[PDB]
């Protein structure tokens, strides 16, 4: 079994940056992001930095790159990082697709 | 609006996404997501396949031509939109009410695919 | 282990009815009500039917009555009804609470 | 708005809600609402307890008042609200980023608890 009781959430927004892919020492994938979502004017922006494993992984880095509108369907997690001692919000992915709001897509496998 | 309740939704399209043109001339799709969970068996020590939810989905415009170009029977998509009752006639007197989801977001996962993203 | 894919929402509205409760034949309770959500002028209510089990069932039973504000998160199932063949989509809830927007609650337990 | 990032968190809080009022004279309540989750280990056979998520919640006028005389220290909560990042002095010349949930509907679990609603 996975957990329970954790926190879900849906994001839309736009990447910041092109994935970042990298391997571990065993041979899996990881990719790392940012999705900026604005509100609205244009209200303040949302950033949060995703995490995503395996073929998913290597998925995003081939499809998406720098200012891709994506939903993002994941679960809230905390990493402890360098001042005092703080702690920030990330999102490990689940899902992830472009939208297809603004724009088509070619979708493959 | 305020006061919509919003639902993510994944899982498979049943069928290519049926694109119709209402009076006013405005694109309208229509598709079914057959969303199937997972169940682990405390039992057997292995996850097996739960019982598919199915949604209905509505969405509008060129979101909907784009919907209708790029999606296909049995893509995996992520669906972010509103639950929304409405009621229709069936003829003997008796309104049947459904829930559909009004699609704000859908995307192709890519779980397992990959998109070129034309960015129109 | 639970499940996992699993759809879930987060519904706010008012019972249309007290809820009501039951005991099956192995003495476990279980309580059903429905969760009228009204958007906004008003626009059309959504009136979702809900399922809870056991001591929750219990508490809800005792707590709330018709008209209540209530947030509730449950996971999305579809039960198979009675004219060709029909399904209707209802809510295992997971938690439920009387919303504090409108109204204060003495909480015991 | 539009465009919002929206969440539902349960759990615990931290502390009594703090209550306070701005020059507008707009009362406006902070709190820390702790969810434990749940991990299933495959090994032993029994869910254990896993990691809190800490999310810090503000919540505005009569709700807020509603929220800081119902509830205390460690009761289960159920939050519905808008994931906001905002930034901070710290000093040393550094903006520190937080991201706090802007609460729109909060209310005590009924899991392990009963309440008595006053309706105002």
């Known amino acids: ?15 910041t940056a092109d994935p970042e892919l990298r391997f571990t020492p065993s ?18 922006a949302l950033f949060l930095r995703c995490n995503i ?3 998913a992984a290597e998925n ?4 998406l790159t720098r200012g891709a509108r994506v939903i993002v369907s ?3 997690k905390q990493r402890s990082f360098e001042g005092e001692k703080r702690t920030v919000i990330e999102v490990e992915v689940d899902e992830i697709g472009p939208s297809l709001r ?4 070619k979708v493959n496998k």
Chains 1, 3 share one sequence.
Request: aromatic share 6%; net charge neutral.
């Open 1 to 15: 079994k996975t957990m329970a009781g954790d926190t879900t959430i849906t994001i839309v927004g736009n990447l």
């Open 27 to 44: 041979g899996a994938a990881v990719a790392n992001f940012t999705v900026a979502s604005t509100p609205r004017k244009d209200g303040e």
């Open 53 to 55: 494993w395996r073929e």
């Open 60 to 63: 995003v880095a081939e499809s």
């Open 74 to 76: 994941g679960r809230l």
């Open 102 to 105: 603004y724009a088509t897509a």
